Design brief:
hydrolase; Bovine pancreatic ribonuclease A; P-30 Protein; Neutron structure; three-stranded antiparallel sheet
Length: 124
Amino acid sequence: KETAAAKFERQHMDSSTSAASSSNYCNQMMKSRNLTKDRCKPVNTFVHESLADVQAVCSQKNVACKNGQTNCYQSYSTMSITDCRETGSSKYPNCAYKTTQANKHIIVACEGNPYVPVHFDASV
């Protein structure tokens, strides 16, 4: 099956664009990346940086995740991100989202060898 590291890339990486260019970015990406296949995922975040720079966060500042685990890390610098949040008109299979573009530090959980991101915890 798809590995946790591969799933993180599919759900949270968009190195092909520097930022969301329109209000329809989330509606198109949530569908294209197959995140609305079984149900409308309520919230998701896409990171507009090189995969290498995001993977490097696993060697930066260690912080506890929201749930208490201690394998989470916060990026030293801010990154270009896009937050997708389900709107009131969203109804499966026609999931709808609001696109919000911002520059924030990201916090990810890391696992494995190579030690890489497998979960997006938050943006601060």
